[PDB]
Amino acid sequence: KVFGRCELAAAMKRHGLDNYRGYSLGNWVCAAKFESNFNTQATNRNTDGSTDYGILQINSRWWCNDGRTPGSRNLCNIPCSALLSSDITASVNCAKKIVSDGNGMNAWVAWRNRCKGTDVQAWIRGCRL
Ligand SMILES: [Cl-]
Ligand SMILES: [Cl-]
Ligand SMILES: [Cl-]
Ligand SMILES: [Cl-]
Ligand SMILES: [Cl-]
Ligand SMILES: [Cl-]
Ligand code: NA
């Protein structure tokens, strides 16, 4: 599924991400835009051999099991393929764990490089929330 901007903001808001650990909704929407272009099916390989999965590009190095990332962890206790559903629940619940771990949203490289310190409210402008 490729979410619309306001469609995803609303889904994210329903799932409790608005101001989760102090990150406004616009941060999460911005992160998803640059991580996946709002595409729940997005997958990208990392140089180390891990893979990033889904709308928030959750990494098999630490967070999910894909059976082909030697040495990795599965801290969200989920198969990586479950993070590719058109329902964003699994991705959001794992994202809550990631963002609580110490680094906040700096865990998402795209957030840090493209969203952090910018006018993130623009991403929810005009949306019924
Ligand atoms: Cl915002
Ligand atoms: Cl593995
Ligand atoms: Cl959903
Ligand atoms: Cl889900
Ligand atoms: Cl923080
Ligand atoms: Cl607004
Ligand atoms: Na893993």
Q: How far is the CA of 49 from the centre of ligand 6 (A)?
A: 39
Choice among 35, 48, 66, 119 that is catalytic: 35
Resolution (A): 1.8
Residue 129 structure tokens: 């929330």
Please give the order of strands across the beta sheet that includes 58-59.
43-45, 51-53, 58-59
**Annotated catalytic, 52?**
yes
Q: Which residues are CB-contacts of 38 (< 8 A; sequence separation ≥ 6)?
A: 2, 3, 4, 5, 8, 32, 55
Q: What are the distances in angstroms from CA 39 to CA 8, 56, 66, 88, 124?
A: 10, 9, 19, 11, 17
Q: Domain limits of the chain? A: 1-129
Q: State which fold the 1-129 domain adopts.
A: Lysozyme (1.10.530)
Which residue carries 């629940």 as its tokens?
A: 89
Using H for helix, E for strand and C for coil, what is the string for 98-120?
HHCCCCHHHHCHHHHHHCCCCCH
Residue 101, annotated as binding a ligand: yes
Report how this structure was experimentally obtained: X-ray
Return the SS3 of 51.
Answer: strand
User: What angle, rounded to 10 degrees, do the helices at 25-36 and 5-14 form?
Assistant: 130
Q: How far apart are CA 7 and CA 12, in angstroms?
A: 9
**Annotated catalytic, 7?**
no
112 residue type, one letter: R
Q: How far is the CA of 89 from the centre of ligand 4 (A)?
A: 4
CA angle 58, 60, 111 (to 5 degrees): 30
